[PDB]
Structures are given as structure tokens and as C-alpha cells.
Amino acid sequence: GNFLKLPDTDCRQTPPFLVLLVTSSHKQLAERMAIRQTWGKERMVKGKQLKTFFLLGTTSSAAETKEVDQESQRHGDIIQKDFLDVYYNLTLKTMMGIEWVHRFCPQAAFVMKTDSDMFINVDYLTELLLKKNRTTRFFTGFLKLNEFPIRQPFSKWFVSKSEYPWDRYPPFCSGTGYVFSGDVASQVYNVSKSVPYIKLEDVFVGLCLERLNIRLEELHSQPTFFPGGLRFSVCLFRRIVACHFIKPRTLLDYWQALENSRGEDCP
Numbered sequence: 001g002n003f004l005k006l007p008d009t010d011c012r013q014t015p016p017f018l019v020l021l022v023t024s025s026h027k028q029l030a031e032r033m034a035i036r037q038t039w040g041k042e043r044m045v046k047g048k049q050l051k052t053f054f055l056l057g058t059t060s061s062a063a064e065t066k067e068v069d070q071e072s073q074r075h076g077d078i079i080q081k082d083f084l085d086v087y088y089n090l091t092l093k094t095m096m097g098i099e100w101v102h103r104f105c106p107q108a109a110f111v112m113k114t115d116s117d118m119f120i121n122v123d124y125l126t127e128l129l130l131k132k133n134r135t136t137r138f139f140t141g142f143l144k145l146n147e148f149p150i151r152q153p154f155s156k157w158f159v160s161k162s163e164y165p166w167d168r169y170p171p172f173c174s175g176t177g178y179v180f181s182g183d184v185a186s187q188v189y190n191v192s193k194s195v196p197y198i199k200l201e202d203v204f205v206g207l208c209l210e211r212l213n214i215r216l217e218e219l220h221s222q223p224t225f226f227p228g229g230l231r232f233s234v235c236l237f238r239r240i241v242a243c244h245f246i247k248p249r250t251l252l253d254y255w256q257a258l259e260n261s262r263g264e265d266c267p
């Protein structure tokens, strides 16, 4: 489907249990390297395969283009299509990831779309997913159920009435990090072209899920996704799935902390 870069992976041969699709801009190589060295590192988690790919568009900068070409050659984990990679094109980026799952990895049990300034606890997420007994039409994250479009015209998330004309958004989950069963990717890709476009990707996915009659659900009886960020502690971070507002150096320090304290107890 018009992909400039495709990861060197074969989901038919080895169906992944969890696929992470990470959004980042071209210049954010430090982010991607920190992820590749921490929670993005591919491995078996309780015998389940984890795969990690980075979603990129294109840029006018020839230097950044060359950097990303070299990075894809070195790492083989970039999914790319020809669209200007800017904040207000994040919907295209998300749909690219979903398209990739649909076309090349329909075997994935679960897919997480996530920001790059994130800590992800794949071990705890896997444990909760294996416990949920939800393998189809499943979508979770930080649920946002009573959202009103932001009409402050200079706000980062401003939408005009022509861009989104109704008083409330559909139910959706924070774009910082949400998780869905793999079949959901095909259903969303199928309905996407008939659903009204909006430049905020997490709202757009919510519109698609609503058209599909897919209901959002909480992953666990306790909160596990934290778009607002969290005060760090080892014992807390062992029992969450996702935390936002984490720069690369911090991500590396937190990962080291969890390694250093492996084998201690907590509650």
C-alpha cells in the first residue's frame, strides 16, 4: 500500500503477541535509541513475542531523509510512507501504522500505538492482557469519555467548528498510548475512509471505533495508563502500563532503576 520502508519481519511465520508502534519525528533519534535500548527491545515476555516498530513520514530536509534512510538500513524497524511528517499529520501516521498491521501483520494478538516520550511496562501489560481474556474487538488505554473539542484558537489541540462541528467528541483513548486486539486494525482501516476526518489522531480512531460499535474498556480494576505523568518509584512503575512526559535520559535512568532493583520485593 505505497510503503517506502517496511520492517524486515514475517508475522505469518512468527505471529507476535504484542506489536508496539511508536510515533516520533525524524530528528527524535535519541528518543528512538532510548526506546530500542529499553522497553522497545524485542524479546519473549512470558513466552510471548514482542516486536517494536517506529512510524515515520517524510520531510523536506535532505539531511534528515538521509539519516532516516541509514537508520532504517541499520535497524530495519521503521514503517514509512510518503506524507509530510508534522504534528497536524499525526492522523495519517496513525493510519499508516494501522494499515501496516492490516496488510502485513494481521496475526498480531495485540498492538499498542504509543508516543515516544513514554515509559511502557511491557511485562505488566502482557500479564494484564493475558488475564483479560479479550482477544477480539478489544480497545483500551486511558479512557476519555466526556471530552469537548478545544475552541481556544492558539491551543495545540484547537479545532475550528468547520474542522469538528459538534459539541462533544466520541469516546476515545489518549493518544499517548492505547492498546487494541489485532483484528481491530483491519476493521479501522476498512472504515477509515468513510468516517469524518479530524487532525487529532486519537479522536479520529475513536470516531472509527464508534462507527464499528467497538466499546472502550478499562484494562484493569486499577489505573494503568498515565497521560499526565507520575512521580517515579520502582514499586509503582512495576504496576503500571504507561507513563507519559518521560524524556530519553529519564527513560534510561528509570530502566536502569528497574534493572538495579530486580529481585527486591515491594508490597
Ligand SMILES: CC(=O)N[C@H]1[C@H](O[C@H]2[C@@H](O)[C@@H](CO)O[C@H](O[C@@H]3[C@H](O)[C@@H](O)[C@H](O[C@H]4[C@H](O)[C@@H](O)[C@H](O)O[C@@H]4CO)O[C@@H]3CO)[C@@H]2O)O[C@H](CO)[C@H](O)[C@@H]1O
Residues within 6 Å of the ligand: 144, 147, 148, 149, 150, 155, 156, 157, 173, 174, 175, 176, 200, 202, 203, 227, 228
Ligand atoms: C494527553 C492527551 O491525551 N491529550 C489529548 C487531549 O487531552 C486533554 C483534554 O482532555 C483537555 C480537556 O480540557 O484536558 C487535558 O489537557 C490539560 C489542559 O486542559 C490543556 O489545556 C493542556 O494543554 C496545553 C495547554 O493548553 C498549554 O497552555 C500548556 O502550555 O501546554 C499544555 C500541553 O502542551 O494540557 C493539560 C494536560 O495535558 C487533556 O490532556 O485532548 C485532545 C483533544 O481535545 C487530544 O485528543 C489530545 O491527544
Ligand SMILES: *[C@@H]1O[C@H](CO[C@@H]2O[C@@H](C)[C@@H](O)[C@@H](O)[C@@H]2O)[C@@H](O[C@@H]2O[C@H](CO)[C@@H](O)[C@H](O)[C@H]2NC(C)=O)[C@H](O)[C@H]1NC(C)=O
Residues within 6 Å of the ligand: 131, 132, 133
Ligand atoms: C480469564 O479466565 C481465567 C480462566 O477461567 C476459565 O477460562 C475463562 C475463559 C472462562 O471460561 C472461565 O469461566 C474459566 O473458568 C480466569 O481465571 C480463573 O478464574 C477462576 C474463577 O475466579 C479460578 O477458579 C481460577 O483459578 C482462575 N485462574 C486460572 C483458571 O488460571 C480469569 O478470572 C478470567 N479473567 C477475568 C477478568 O475474568
Ligand SMILES: *[C@@H]1O[C@H](CO)[C@@H](O[C@@H]2O[C@H](CO)[C@@H](O)[C@H](O)[C@H]2NC(C)=O)[C@H](O)[C@H]1NC(C)=O
Residues within 6 Å of the ligand: 082, 083, 084, 085, 086, 088, 089
Ligand atoms: C500532510 O502530508 C500531506 C502529504 O505529504 C501534505 O499534502 C501535500 O502538501 C504538499 C505541500 O506541503 C503539496 O505540494 C502536495 O500537493 C500535498 N499532497 C497531498 C497528497 O496532500 C499535507 O500538507 C500535510 N499536512 C500538513 C498539515 O502539513
Ligand SMILES: O=c1ccn([C@@H]2O[C@H](COP(=O)(O)OP(=O)(O)O)[C@@H](O)[C@H]2O)c(=O)[nH]1
Residues within 6 Å of the ligand: 022, 023, 024, 025, 026, 028, 085, 086, 087, 090, 093, 114, 115, 116, 117
Ligand atoms: O511531527 C511530528 C510531531 C510529533 N510526533 C510524535 O507524536 C507524539 C506527540 O508529540 P509530542 O509528545 O511532542 O506532544 P505532547 O505529548 O507534548 O502533547 C510524540 O510521540 C512525537 O514524537 C511525530 O511523530 N511527528
Ligand SMILES: [Mn+2]
Residues within 6 Å of the ligand: 115, 116, 117, 176, 244, 245
Ligand atoms: Mn508526548
